[PDB]
């Protein structure tokens, strides 16, 4: 009675790949028949493959602020390298062992094909012109306009471009003179109801104007001749030009190199977290500011005695998933969701409740050096100090 | 679909597409088989010496 | 995109494209295959003399 | 009990190749739909392959003093010889032994295809004409000018 068992291989084709991707359009115009060239990068810059999308992964229209495939549906599969989608994306032995060891794999977007659609004066219909694509139009926008990025509406980068004048080119000396105040008033919706350039609630002096190198070299030479010193007073005399970059942020936070709000300063954290409606030993119905919601990781409960000490139940970063985000505009920080539906450690009203907070500048996700998987590497700003019977 | 703050003749209207990856499904290309053999032998031997 | 030195009529505007390689990734074609086996014999003979 | 262990080979198809390349335009005017022809040289002047860039390796614009892809992004991969990218670039056994011994493999650039985008007086737009490359233009620049 014999029993055999075999396991072959091939050290040039030892694995296949399948990427689940999704497209986003964050511009101000739609793009038709989208086909993005895109490449799978292993390690630091070891590119396995570059794949222009085939016809199975072809969008047909991607309007601004829309996803393909839409956000209620599942992403599309990219598993082809042939021009007819008959050949998979392979991987040899060393790349497979290295990816299974270190789990590093990303996807770069090199360029995007896509048509343009234009109004037709005979019947008013919109025709997609298959001889044209947006790769002939964006380099002409980029060399004759001025970029203003802005993140004052819910802290995301809203990039626009305003047609400004280039003084060393005769066809571009014909556009009207574009100031910075008019550019902010027509590109983003800044208005001046009382002679002051505001956004919806803020003022322009609540923002700050980080430029590029050549743009700041232009702004200082513009403020020399103006005989002014504050940028916020002479916004309606600053001429713009072509190939300018201007970056306008919110003055309330700090940002990383990638210009995302990853933490505020210490004062503004407590100013919008205090209106409470429901309170019990089940859950804490606080309200949270939408900006500071994007930097807070999670809330960690504590127990304090009559004398004053610490008793942290959640000394583990996978117990930082305490937040709830309901439909009534509040949060509901529960207490038994990571206690197996057994309540808090409250026995007396004189025992007060305390929760200490942390922003993403001050968190840790991976383990520490020796043994601090606890809350000793968590920087805390005093938000929550009230008694245990005033919350329940 | 040209968004309304781009309708001004001085505000440019252009798309910004990028692709972001949400899963990666690696499928190991290995082949395997089994075998099951059951024999039977009937030795019959005469021996004169 | 024509850089401003070439907007004079007497200066030519032309591209100079040149590919440089940054990595060779070579994959040796080969195929391993292992095989394990068991076997259980049961011989019951009988010699008559 | 038994334990077997087998290693096959094929002495005309022992290794495959995948080059990571990047394009530079140091000239004065952009070139659209770029498609270089590059040949992979082993040793001194022994040539393994001559590959035109397929559809996966096409650059749509290459403005002057720009790269494709940009310097923050990883290079593109060239691993195909078929017109439809369904055939790898191979080498035989002697070439693999010499390459692992001495490590000399470079990349030449013979020629570059790519289109011109001219003005349109009717509506101001700029439209790539797909029936004319720079190889009808550049030999006429190279003979009436001075470098």
UniProtKB/Swiss-Prot annotation, chains B, C:
Ranges annotated as biased composition (Polar residues): 32-49
Gene: pagA
Domain of life: Bacteria
Domain remark from Swiss-Prot or TrEMBL: To pass through this hydrophobic restriction, substrate proteins LF and EF need to be unfolded prior to translocation.
Known partners and oligomeric status: Homooligomer; homooligomerizes to form homoheptamers (PA-63(7)) or homooctamers (PA-63(8)). PA-63(7) or PA-63(8) form ring-shaped oligomers that are in a pre-pore conformation, which do not penetrate the host membrane. PA-63(8) displays an enhanced stability, suggesting that this form circulates in the blood to reach and exert toxicity even in distant tissues. Interacts with lethal factor (LF) and edema factor (EF); can bind LF and EF simultaneously and interaction takes place following homooligomerization on the host cell membrane.
Subcellular location: Host cell membrane; Host endosome membrane
Physiological role: Mature form that oligomerizes and forms a pore to translocate the enzymatic toxin components edema factor (EF) and lethal factor (LF) into the host cytosol. Following attachment to host cell receptors and cleavage by FURIN, homooligomerizes to form ring-shaped oligomers that are in a pre-pore conformation, and associates with EF and LF. Toxin-leaded complexes are then endocytosed in a clathrin-dependent process, followed by a conformational change of oligomerized PA-63 from the pre-pore to pore state, which is triggered by the low pH in the endosome.
Bilayer disposition of the protein: Multi-pass membrane protein
Region span, Disordered: 28-49
Full protein name: Protective antigen PA-63
UniProtKB/Swiss-Prot annotation, chain D:
Phenotype when changing residue 68 to C: Loss of capability to undergo conformational changes that lead to pore formation and translocation
Region (Domain 2, membrane insertion and heptamerization) residue spans: 1-144
Annotated phenotype, changing residue 3 to A: Loss of toxicity probably due to faulty membrane insertion or translocation of LF/EF into the cytosol
Localisation per UniProt entry: Host cell membrane; Host endosome membrane
Phenotype upon changing residue 39 to C: Loss of capability to undergo conformational changes that lead to pore formation and translocation
Consequence of substituting residue 50 to C: Loss of capability to undergo conformational changes that lead to pore formation and translocation
Topology within the bilayer: Multi-pass membrane protein
Domain of life: Bacteria
Site feature (Alpha-clamp) residues: 121
Site annotation Phi-clamp: residues: 84
Subunit structure: Homooligomer; homooligomerizes to form homoheptamers (PA-63(7)) or homooctamers (PA-63(8)). PA-63(7) or PA-63(8) form ring-shaped oligomers that are in a pre-pore conformation, which do not penetrate the host membrane. PA-63(8) displays an enhanced stability, suggesting that this form circulates in the blood to reach and exert toxicity even in distant tissues. Interacts with lethal factor (LF) and edema factor (EF); can bind LF and EF simultaneously and interaction takes place following homooligomerization on the host cell membrane.
UniProt comment concerning the protein's domains: Phe-84 residue forms the phi-clamp in the pore and catalyzes protein translocation via a charge-state-dependent Brownian ratchet. To pass through this hydrophobic restriction, substrate proteins LF and EF need to be unfolded prior to translocation.
Function according to Swiss-Prot or TrEMBL: Mature form that oligomerizes and forms a pore to translocate the enzymatic toxin components edema factor (EF) and lethal factor (LF) into the host cytosol. Following attachment to host cell receptors and cleavage by FURIN, homooligomerizes to form ring-shaped oligomers that are in a pre-pore conformation, and associates with EF and LF. Toxin-leaded complexes are then endocytosed in a clathrin-dependent process, followed by a conformational change of oligomerized PA-63 from the pre-pore to pore state, which is triggered by the low pH in the endosome.
UniProt protein name: Protective antigen PA-63
Originating organism: Bacillus anthracis
Full protein stretch here: 373 to 519 of 764
